[PDB]
Write a protein that binds this ligand. Structure first.
Ligand SMILES: CCCCCCCCCO[C@@H]1O[C@H](CO)[C@@H](O)[C@H](O)[C@H]1O
Ligand SMILES: CCCCCCCCCO[C@@H]1O[C@H](CO)[C@@H](O)[C@H](O)[C@H]1O
Ligand SMILES: CCCCCCCCCO[C@@H]1O[C@H](CO)[C@@H](O)[C@H](O)[C@H]1O
Ligand SMILES: CCCCCCCCCO[C@@H]1O[C@H](CO)[C@@H](O)[C@H](O)[C@H]1O
Ligand SMILES: CCCCCCCCCO[C@@H]1O[C@H](CO)[C@@H](O)[C@H](O)[C@H]1O
Ligand SMILES: CCCCCCCCCO[C@@H]1O[C@H](CO)[C@@H](O)[C@H](O)[C@H]1O
Ligand SMILES: CCCCCCCCCO[C@@H]1O[C@H](CO)[C@@H](O)[C@H](O)[C@H]1O
Ligand SMILES: CCCCCCCCCO[C@@H]1O[C@H](CO)[C@@H](O)[C@H](O)[C@H]1O
Ligand SMILES: CCCCCCCCCO[C@@H]1O[C@H](CO)[C@@H](O)[C@H](O)[C@H]1O
Ligand SMILES: CCCCCCCCCO[C@@H]1O[C@H](CO)[C@@H](O)[C@H](O)[C@H]1O
Ligand SMILES: CCCCCCCCCO[C@@H]1O[C@H](CO)[C@@H](O)[C@H](O)[C@H]1O
Ligand SMILES: CCCCCCCCCO[C@@H]1O[C@H](CO)[C@@H](O)[C@H](O)[C@H]1O
Ligand SMILES: CCCCCCCCCO[C@@H]1O[C@H](CO)[C@@H](O)[C@H](O)[C@H]1O
Ligand SMILES: CCCCCCCCCO[C@@H]1O[C@H](CO)[C@@H](O)[C@H](O)[C@H]1O
Ligand SMILES: CCCCCCCCCO[C@@H]1O[C@H](CO)[C@@H](O)[C@H](O)[C@H]1O
Ligand SMILES: CCCCCCCCCO[C@@H]1O[C@H](CO)[C@@H](O)[C@H](O)[C@H]1O
Ligand SMILES: CCCCCCCCCO[C@@H]1O[C@H](CO)[C@@H](O)[C@H](O)[C@H]1O
Ligand SMILES: CCCCCCCCCO[C@@H]1O[C@H](CO)[C@@H](O)[C@H](O)[C@H]1O
Ligand SMILES: [Cl-]
Ligand SMILES: [Cl-]
Ligand SMILES: [Cl-]
Ligand SMILES: [Cl-]
Ligand SMILES: [Cl-]
Ligand SMILES: [Cl-]
Ligand SMILES: [Cl-]
Ligand SMILES: [Cl-]
Ligand SMILES: [Cl-]
Ligand SMILES: [Cl-]
Ligand SMILES: [Cl-]
Ligand SMILES: [Cl-]
Lengths: 181, 4, 181, 181, 4, 181, 4, 181, 181, 4, 4, 4
């Protein structure tokens, strides 16, 4: 009937951050939540994850949260809250790492995690149908189009290319690991 | 400015 | 299974107006349907409501009617046609009044009514769960984002700020009144 | 539960073409798949249909495939795979013919077929309710808005006007024919 | 021109 | 050294109108200055001309006034203030007449007059070089591109097609008349 | 809305 | 014949900063050159001025430098290099101060200085014609339109409203002071 | 006083092509004038040059021809018509060659030639002041910004990167050669 | 360029 | 993001 | 589609 606690808390956290970005301004929030951009911020551990909470426009937040609501909700319903938490932390940390390596620390959004969820849900359904999870055919198409659009720069927004490839890789790797018996 |  | 008579007739009326605006032009329709813009039009009573029927672009009409179809349909299904009618009339009249006060008569769209419906459905579900109506969690998020986007001007269109705040207030007030036993 | 084989294969074919257009470039794919643009290509029979597979932007492909997935899926589920195939071939061929007549061969997309499906599903439901197919009320509204937007040029993209009118006509004519007992 |  | 009195007063009048449109709103100014849009306004004679004073965006006003400053200034300097006045009145009245005939009264801008000035200055220089006026070669090119862009809708703004063709015709006709000895 |  | 040393060095400094912003990224340059955004940066005195060197797009830099080249060049030619330097420092410092007060430190561009130059050159020509400087009539119009466009938000970019009003005020005040005998 | 015969004939040829592209469509003209895109077109020698004549929008043609009019006009006036012809042919041929190598044959515009002219005029003025040609200081700035904008993709249009670097190189090399005594 |  |  |  409805989104579980992890699915919901991420959505609420993203909205709360988005409101703060409108009231305070984007830069001021980025100072607090971006991947560490100076050696003095290296132990502010939250920053390795909170880049995923920031969004820069209406279309940016809407489409990230629409995919998260669907895929995160499915993961949480079929595999449980803890599974969603771990996929979220791994994809956020690793996608941030690769993005910062390619292009520095000034990036944000939930799409490293989303692309991990796309790969994860699709591959786990293919390799481990008895899990009870899968990516419905029609959504495979739209997930594929979303991948193509990120990769070929079709969104009309500068792309976190490193985050995208690293997230999708993570999600596939986790599905692989999880499908072994 | 920022990557999305 | 399907949209009730009030939900449907509003949708059809908006499309019919939208077609007229494409064939005749927007200005010519605004002359007929806008909030009274000269003292000679003060007794043309329809004008206090028909501003809600006009839309100015594809994205404007599509997103207003998508929210109306969902929320209006829910109201009509769970609380009945008459309830939807009264929420529509009150929100249209009051949202027009506030908008014209702040910024004059040259505005249109169904979003005073929509923002009333967002507030109404959410608050009535919270305060009066036994009504059988509520705003599902995920749609709370997207309704919230829609509110933020109207308020902070994130749609890429000039905003009827007075209509928006007045509609949301109306919808909350009505839910409050309706939840008293 | 899911899209049938014809619904799916069209979606996959459009994505595969769209990927080729990003990797190879649009022009290079158009050379291969466009309506014949030189007398030397007149016997390359695929060209009378493959114009329907090409899309030129993210919004172009997304909205064409969203409507196809819904309407094509409904046709295929209620009337069968063969019916969808024949509606697709007739609408693609005839919509291409009219478009090229009005404006030459440099066009593409699935929207001749989609507008045929809109007309078809709506009219067959109206005239032949015992078919088991129909266009739900709310989707009538949005289909109508899609028609208005194509006709009055509201998409922010140059329109294949001939394809649109020819597709819708085809779909209505087929529903008419199919509703005779 | 118009408010939406 | 500088723009004459007619060149200047038109520029100032357009800015003053443009400021009023920002402070009061566009619609409210259009009510006052547009071509008569109701039979009750038919004797408000200024309206047959004041449509030329209204502009709807920064790019709209900037490019109209840039061409007027150049061409109007040239006319006024070489042929005198009275000549500029008469070309302005004839082109404004006739371009408004044709535009309203094709598309109704909701239009504005100085470009009927500008396109008249393009035709006029070019043709008078060609047919009557001893006038002392002419359109320098490079500006012929850019005037030509401006004509093509109006005619083929390349400005990203809805075009007053009737005003454009009627203005250019007027300016050519006047140059013709003025070049007879 | 308006022609330019 | 050509731009003096101050006019030129500002242009070169802006291009050099703009190149750095493309190679390094905007945020990284903003960290170095923005108005102090943390108490630890309060003695980094350059920051009270270097906000004027940053530009965020092609149209942003092009139009700022076009106005500076013209007006700065005129000041420097007629009143000398030192005069341009002092107008630049005062307008940059004061426009930054007001902008940060209204909206915080995340702003940039040369337009506080430019709007000071508009006011200065116009007013000094009006009050002190014997200076040898003045704003030619046609450029008064375009300067006025630039002012209106900044004030009413017509550029399609978020505006440094405080910088704009403070710069124009500064330039007028300086012209006033300079015109006293 | 005015543009020489080569400067003019290029401008006219570009407008004539641009008109043909609006009347016939862009693709149809590209078929005729693009760099050879099939081995059967390899001896159609004009194609190695006529890619320079095609432009795809108003801003594309306007800004290419504005720079050509200025720089080409200067070359032709100070160094003669033949010099302009040879710089044009070399830059068009070599810039097309490099562009097609990097990205295939679907490109157009005069900007390989323009960037050659920027490099040429600047370098020849620096190395061979007695030529009588040079790039005025202020235009150095704007030429530099144009280079940065092409290189960093700041025009909002897909860039012919190979044409740009090859043109600028050509123009510098020719100035070098021409400055030897 | 192309019709959609 | 930034004011211009 | 095309490079400029
Ligand atoms: C999109 O629909 C939503 O998908 C989520 C997960 O798949 C669910 O949490 C939710 O209940 C459902 O409405
Ligand atoms: C539901 C609301 C979600 C809003 C986003 C929360 C971002 C959390 C990062 O903030 C940090 O959290 C640390 C605790 O781990 C504190 O020690 C530190 O001082 C604080 O800066
Ligand atoms: C993990 O502990 C960290 O140890 C560091 C010592 O190197 C400190 O810089 C930092 O404050 C502290 O949080
Ligand atoms: C979005 O879905 C629609 O929501 C409406 C109201 O909630 C219903 O009228 C309709 O039947 C349903 O399809
Ligand atoms: C389903 C179609 C909906 C289209 C929108 C209808 C707008 C209704 C306002 O018009 C007015 O209605 C009055 C009756 O109350 C008439 O007295 C008056 O002369 C007329 O101007
Ligand atoms: C409500 O009745 C109104 O009474 C007015 C008299 O003041 C008239 O102006 C108007 O025509 C009429 O509709
Ligand atoms: C949108 O929903 C989809 O509609 C299709 C056809 O109507 C179905 O193929 C699919 O199963 C369903 O999810
Ligand atoms: C699922 C993948 C869909 C991709 C789109 C396929 C386009 C098919 C048109 O190609 C043509 O097919 C003919 C066979 O009929 C061949 O004879 C011909 O040489 C080839 O050019
Ligand atoms: C259908 O057959 C076609 O016959 C033509 C002969 O006119 C050939 O041009 C073509 O190759 C061939 O496919
Ligand atoms: C563009 O330049 C301007 O052209 C005008 C007319 O041609 C003149 O009024 C003015 O003096 C001159 O500066
Ligand atoms: C330099 C400022 C230019 C601003 C534009 C002026 C528009 C003039 C039209 O107004 C009308 O003028 C008439 C006089 O002919 C009045 O009788 C009438 O009541 C008034 O409505
Ligand atoms: C021109 O004179 C007009 O005569 C009309 C009489 O028909 C009046 O309507 C109008 O007020 C008056 O200005
Ligand atoms: C715009 O033209 C330029 O104006 C500058 C100042 O007014 C001069 O420095 C320069 O020489 C001149 O070309
Ligand atoms: C022509 C090139 C122009 C580029 C822009 C120059 C910005 C100057 C600000 O930098 C600062 O300058 C100080 C000296 O005053 C140094 O002490 C300090 O460490 C350094 O950070
Ligand atoms: C001005 O001198 C400043 O004195 C401060 C002492 O308060 C230091 O913080 C700073 O380094 C130094 O530059
Ligand atoms: C920009 O001005 C133009 O520059 C050209 C070349 O520099 C000249 O051909 C022309 O005469 C002159 O008006
Ligand atoms: C001033 C008008 C400029 C318009 C652009 C002209 C493009 C010229 C390329 O066309 C080709 O020219 C050849 C002659 O060399 C012909 O043999 C060939 O058949 C023809 O296709
Ligand atoms: C250069 O001459 C070319 O010789 C070729 C022979 O290889 C022909 O293909 C071509 O027609 C002809 O123009
Ligand atoms: Cl939910
Ligand atoms: Cl990247
Ligand atoms: Cl429904
Ligand atoms: Cl408002
Ligand atoms: Cl499906
Ligand atoms: Cl068409
Ligand atoms: Cl002037
Ligand atoms: Cl028209
Ligand atoms: Cl200079
Ligand atoms: Cl501000
Ligand atoms: Cl010239
Ligand atoms: Cl390239």
């Amino acid at each position: 009937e409805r989104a579980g606690p992890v699915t919901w808390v991420m959505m609420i956290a993203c909205v709360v951050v988005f409101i703060a970005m409108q009231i305070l301004g984007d830069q001021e929030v980025m100072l607090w939540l971006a991947w560490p951009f100076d050696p003095t911020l290296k132990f502010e551990f939250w920053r390795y994850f909170t880049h995923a909470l920031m969004h820069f426009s209406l279309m940016h937040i809407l489409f990230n949260l629409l995919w998260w609501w669907y895929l995160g909700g499915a993961v949480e319903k079929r595999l449980g809250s803890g599974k969603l938490i771990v996929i979220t932390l791994i994809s956020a940390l690793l996608s941030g790492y690769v993005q910062q390596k390619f292009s520095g620390p000034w990036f944000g959004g939930l799409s490293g995690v989303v692309y991990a969820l796309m790969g994860y849900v699709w591959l786990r359904g293919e390799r481990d149908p008895q899990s009870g999870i899968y990516l419905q055919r029609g959504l495979i198409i739209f997930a594929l189009i979303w991948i193509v659009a990120g990769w070929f720069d079709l969104f009309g927004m500068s792309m976190a290319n490193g985050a995208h490839i690293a997230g999708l890789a993570v999600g596939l790797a986790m599905a692989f690991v999880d499908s072994l018996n | 400015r920022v990557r999305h």
